[PDB]
Design an enzyme around this catalytic site. Structure first.
Site, PDB file in Angstrom:
ATOM      1  N   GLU A  60       0.087  -3.887  -8.487  1.00 47.30           N
ATOM      2  CA  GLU A  60      -1.021  -4.759  -8.927  1.00 47.30           C
ATOM      3  C   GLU A  60      -1.790  -4.243 -10.130  1.00 47.30           C
ATOM      4  O   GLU A  60      -1.989  -3.052 -10.266  1.00 47.30           O
ATOM      5  CB  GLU A  60      -2.031  -4.912  -7.748  1.00 47.30           C
TER       6      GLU A  60
ATOM      7  N   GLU B 146       1.324 -15.332  -3.080  1.00 48.56           N
ATOM      8  CA  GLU B 146       1.973 -14.590  -2.012  1.00 48.56           C
ATOM      9  C   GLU B 146       1.097 -14.468  -0.756  1.00 48.56           C
ATOM     10  O   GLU B 146      -0.123 -14.580  -0.904  1.00 48.56           O
ATOM     11  CB  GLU B 146       2.189 -13.113  -2.415  1.00 48.56           C
TER      12      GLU B 146
ATOM     13  N   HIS C 288       5.368   2.136 -10.093  1.00 49.97           N
ATOM     14  CA  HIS C 288       4.348   2.764  -9.239  1.00 49.97           C
ATOM     15  C   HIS C 288       5.017   3.414  -8.039  1.00 49.97           C
ATOM     16  O   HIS C 288       6.154   3.063  -7.740  1.00 49.97           O
ATOM     17  CB  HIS C 288       3.355   1.730  -8.674  1.00 49.97           C
TER      18      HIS C 288
ATOM     19  N   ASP D 100      13.805  12.632 -18.567  1.00 50.98           N
ATOM     20  CA  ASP D 100      13.645  11.642 -19.592  1.00 50.98           C
ATOM     21  C   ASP D 100      14.967  11.080 -20.096  1.00 50.98           C
ATOM     22  O   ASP D 100      15.878  11.755 -20.627  1.00 50.98           O
ATOM     23  CB  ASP D 100      12.781  12.424 -20.621  1.00 50.98           C
TER      24      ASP D 100
ATOM     25  N   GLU E 120       7.276   5.676 -22.379  1.00 50.94           N
ATOM     26  CA  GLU E 120       8.001   5.587 -21.138  1.00 50.94           C
ATOM     27  C   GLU E 120       8.304   4.215 -20.580  1.00 50.94           C
ATOM     28  O   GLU E 120       9.435   3.982 -20.093  1.00 50.94           O
ATOM     29  CB  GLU E 120       7.360   6.433 -20.044  1.00 50.94           C
TER      30      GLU E 120
HETATM   31 CA   LIG Z   1      11.950   7.905 -20.779  1.00 48.83          CA
END
Ligand SMILES: [Ca+2]
EC number: 3.2.1.2
Length: 516
Positions: free
Chosen positions: A172, A367, A89, A60, A141
């Site tokens: 996506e 695209e 992702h 973190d 996050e």
């Molecule tokens: Ca973080």
């Protein structure tokens, strides 16, 4: 283009970078030349994924923007612009894949329940992205990752043309409903992914909230649920998709399931506008997958989309308008087939999305879904891009054009263009009241000889007493065109005597005059 106009005057073209890092693929100095070439060919920016797994790998707030900063300075060395994607992702992970950059392994320990991943109807677990259900973990996050990124990229704001966000897997906004592990890859139906314990309680608590108690649930749904625990996601995805979806229960469940992505869309939209706006002031966008298979299947309609999370595209797009996010759609190179067994209808989907996007006033971009190795596919991309108002088109991917000068050259002619406002004038048009005058021509930008839905409309200049239009055309390309009259009733009444041409259309605004 549709509705009597021309191509989007803001149209710009973009090239997708490779999946590996540049130093894995070439060297910075060759990249700079490749960008310079790409720019010669009408490309305006290089779009590139920066992986979350690379930027916050060891723990973190232990950030490492060094690859990203380096990549921009070269973009800046080559006189180009770039569009970063914050890829929250996983990249690849199954061999044959070019990458393997899972998300940061420590993020999972943030919870001891099963709220951060996905589980399908048959229990397959997916961890390629965080479940939009865990929005506390998301807001922390991604807000932190967004805001640090904005700090590391500030010195380069001048080469940043837009920012993309990743709304889910493969970048996506969706559920991981079509995977090889889950036995749901193209072209099969998609499995719902709301089978964690946490997804079930969330669905329950949203139903109790909507109707108060089990007693009003049961009235609403016409069911005989004995206790609150029996409130559940569908027990058989196939029956649910054959007819379960029509029931009141089925509408409520789809409304929550897609609603979770409308909510996600609004959350990252707000986190990205807060991190980026004041410093970069660039448009921010997100993507919708082109889930084209099982579209027109007669017994499990939209069998791949629904499970992906797309039930109502008008509703999904309203969330984008509300988050102030531009949309990116894929599959612009494909044609409808719509036959057993894949029942694939990609062109029809793209047209539906475009139309809703434009009606909603959302900026649109496209695209290709697969690599283009031939010019007929480029032609199909151009038909869609220039007749449905696409503001931009990005090509996947780098190596397809960069090491094939033939395709690069075909791309430049048809899609690497610069739009320029031009004045078209036609004198002495023999119209009667209620007739309309249009132009149509050989390029996609001119509607490819179509008189039915893509022709460009002209207007009567009383003062000069002639028909004329400010039309946007592709600069420096040779065009052939003809005016024609359409009777009040919609039918072509007659054509201009001689075919006109403009060789090429000029780089500076000016007028092309001709006589009926
Ligand atoms: Ca973080």
């Amino acid at each position: 283009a549709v509705n009597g106009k021309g191509m989007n005057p803001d149209y710009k073209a973009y090239l997708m970078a490779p999946l590996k890092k540049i130093p894995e693929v070439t060297n910075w100095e060759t990249f700079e030349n490749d960008l310079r070439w790409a720019k010669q060919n009408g490309f305006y920016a290089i779009t590139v994924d920066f992986w979350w797994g690379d930027m916050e790998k060891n723990g973190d707030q232990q950030f490492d923007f060094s690859y990203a900063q380096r990549f921009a300075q070269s973009v800046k060395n080559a006189g180009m612009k770039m569009i970063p994607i914050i890829s929250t992702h996983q990249c690849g992970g199954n061999v044959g894949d070019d990458c393997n950059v899972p998300i940061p392994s420590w993020v999972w320990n943030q919870k001891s329940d099963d709220s951060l991943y996905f589980k399908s109807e048959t229990g397959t677990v997916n961890k390629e992205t965080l479940n939009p259900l865990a929005s506390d973990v998301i807001r922390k996050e991604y807000g932190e990752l967004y805001t640090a990124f904005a700090a590391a990229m500030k010195p380069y704001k001048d080469v940043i043309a837009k920012i993309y966000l990743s709304g889910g897997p493969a970048g996506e906004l969706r559920y991981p409903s079509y995977t090889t592990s889950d036995g749901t890859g193209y072209p099969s139906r998609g499995k719902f992914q709301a089978y964690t314990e946490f997804a079930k309680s969330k669905f329950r608590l949203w139903v109790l909230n909507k109707y108060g108690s089990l007693n009003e649930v049961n009235k609403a749904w016409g069911t005989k649920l004995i206790s609150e625990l029996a409130i559940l996601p569908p027990s058989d995805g196939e029956q649910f998709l054959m007819n379960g979806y029509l029931s009141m229960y089925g509408k409520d469940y789809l409304e929550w399931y897609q609603g979770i992505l409308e909510n996600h869309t609004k959350l990252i939209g707000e986190l990205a506008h807060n991190a980026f706006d004041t410093t970069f002031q660039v448009p921010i966008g997100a993507k919708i997958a082109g889930v084209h298979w099982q579209y027109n299947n007669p017994t499990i309609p939209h069998g791949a989309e629904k499970p992906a999370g797309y039930n109502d595209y008008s509703h999904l797009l309203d969330a984008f308008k509300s988050a102030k996010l531009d949309v990116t759609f894929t599959c612009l190179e494909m044609t409808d087939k719509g036959s057993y067994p894949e029942y694939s209808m990609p062109k029809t989907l793209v047209q539906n999305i475009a139309t809703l996007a434009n009606e909603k006033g959302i900026v649109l971009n496209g695209e290709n879904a697969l690599s283009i190795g031939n010019e007929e596919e480029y032609k199909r991309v151009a038909e869609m891009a220039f007749n449905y108002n696409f503001a931009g088109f990005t090509l996947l991917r780098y190596q397809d054009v960069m090491y094939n000068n033939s395709l690069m050259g075909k791309f430049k002619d048809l899609l690497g263009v610069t739009p320029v406002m031009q004045t078209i004038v036609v004198k002495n048009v023999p119209t009667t009241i209620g007739d309309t005058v249009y132009i149509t021509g050989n390029r996609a930008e001119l509607g490819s000889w179509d008189t039915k839905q893509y022709p460009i409309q002209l207007y009567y200049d009383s003062h000069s007493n002639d028909w004329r239009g400010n039309v946007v055309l592709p600069a420096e390309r040779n065009i052939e065109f003809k005016a024609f009259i359409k009777s009040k009733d919609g039918t072509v009444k007659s054509w201009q005597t001689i075919q006109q041409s403009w060789n090429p259309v000029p780089l500076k605004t000016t007028s092309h005059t001709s006589s009926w």
